[PDB]
Amino acid sequence: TLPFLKCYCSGHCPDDAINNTCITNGHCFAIIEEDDQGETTLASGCMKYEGSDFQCKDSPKAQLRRTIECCRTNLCNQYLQPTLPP
């Protein structure tokens, strides 16, 4: 199915993103991730529909603390700021 959704992207931008946006038939996401030192990063982008249930759900058994959040209205993820799991 054709991409119908426009998303913000940062860190996961495609090689030919324009003005920091991307398109997809799946979801926009934002993710916060903590490395081994306690430092966090925020990133965002587009996720295609196939396999998106696995990725939006994520595994709670991941070794690194991180939270991904997905949404399905245009740009929804731009100011999305998910939080590490408590």
Binding site: H12, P14, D15, C22, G45, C46, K48, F54, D58, A62
Partner: protein, 103 residues
């Protein structure tokens, strides 16, 4: 630096094939390289298996990450010399990387 296409020109002189390939002198082949991180973004055109493998790696790093490889290739034609020194035109499929993704 995540999975993407990189430049690679294959010049037949530089691989020492000037004597059997008569045309072309070389071509842009490209290659794919770079990390397949979580999550796999739309432009990485990943399979379900690569997505699952990526999540498993994040749970236990003894399972490797998915790999950045060509996911679309195109053909080139070449003229060459055979056993007896005659010129044959041959289409070679899958010679040029058009797109990379995590698999």
């Amino acid at each position: 630096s995540s999975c993407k296409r990189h430049p690679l020109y294959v010049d037949f002189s530089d691989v020492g094939w000037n004597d059997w390939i008569v045309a072309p002198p070389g071509y842009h082949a490209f290659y794919c390289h770079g990390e397949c991180p979580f999550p796999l973004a739309d432009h990485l055109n990943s399979t379900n298996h690569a997505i699952v493998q990526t999540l498993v790696n994040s749970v236990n790093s003894k399972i490797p990450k998915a790999c950045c490889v060509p996911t679309e290739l195109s053909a080139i034609s070449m003229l060459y010399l055979d056993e007896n020194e005659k010129v044959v035109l041959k289409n070679y499929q899958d010679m040029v990387v058009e797109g990379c993704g995590c698999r």
